[PDB]
Amino acid sequence: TDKDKLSYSIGADLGKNFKNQGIDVNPEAMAKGMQEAMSGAQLALTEQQMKDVLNKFQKDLMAKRTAEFNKKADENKVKGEAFLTENKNKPGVVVLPSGLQYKVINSGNGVKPGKSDTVTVEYTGRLIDGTVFDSTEKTGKPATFQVSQVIPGWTEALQLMPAGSTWEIYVPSGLAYGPRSVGGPIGPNETLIFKIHLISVKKSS
Numbered sequence: 001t002d003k004d005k006l007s008y009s010i011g012a013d014l015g016k017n018f019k020n021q022g023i024d025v026n027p028e029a030m031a032k033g034m035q036e037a038m039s040g041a042q043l044a045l046t047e048q049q050m051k052d053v054l055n056k057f058q059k060d061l062m063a064k065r066t067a068e069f070n071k072k073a074d075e076n077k078v079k080g081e082a083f084l085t086e087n088k089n090k091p092g093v094v095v096l097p098s099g100l101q102y103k104v105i106n107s108g109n110g111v112k113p114g115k116s117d118t119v120t121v122e123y124t125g126r127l128i129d130g131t132v133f134d135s136t137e138k139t140g141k142p143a144t145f146q147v148s149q150v151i152p153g154w155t156e157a158l159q160l161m162p163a164g165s166t167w168e169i170y171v172p173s174g175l176a177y178g179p180r181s182v183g184g185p186i187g188p189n190e191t192l193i194f195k196i197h198l199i200s201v202k203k204s205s
Contacts, residue, residue, distance in 0.1 A: 114205020
């Protein structure tokens with residue numbers, strides 16, 4: 001039933017998303033006004049009426065998502081201060097003054113990078129609950145970055161890591177993206193975990 005089936009598939013993708021974001025919407029009232037609009041028919045409401053309705057909506061929805069974002073921030077920060085607290089007691093783990101922790105997996109003996117160097121690395125990043133959010137082993141290929149053009153916690157660790165080294169680091173949100181997180185699996189104030197293997201460094205420091 002192509003067309004009536006395409007319609008169905010579209011509706012479902014729409015309903016999925018409204019129920020995810022929490023929106024009491026009435027599909028049939030939506031149907032009716034979509035039809036009236038597509039048949040150039042007599043609209044039950046005027047331009048401004050519908051417009052003022054869709055602003056009170058965006059206003060509604062900006063308020064909702066501010067509150068969503070703020071819950072996420074209190075909750076993410078609390079889950080990190082406990083993750084980090086319990087991690088502290090696990091063997092191998094060292095806490096640095098800045099709250100960054102690391103476990104050494106293998107010690108290199110090559111040069112250490114500085115602020116104004118470029119590094120090549122292989123890494124996996126995951127959230128406290130083990131959701132992987134990025135990995136070089138998914139692109140089959142290593143990554144190149146300037147030491148001072150990455151999150152604070154990478155910058156601090158890297159300056160302690162001889163090339164050849166493999167470390168697991170645990171990164172308080174203050175040293176990561178902070179509360180500036182607006183999209184995806186990484187929410188505001190999320191504590192981040194990385195395995196980092198440092199292959200090479202472009203200069204001394």
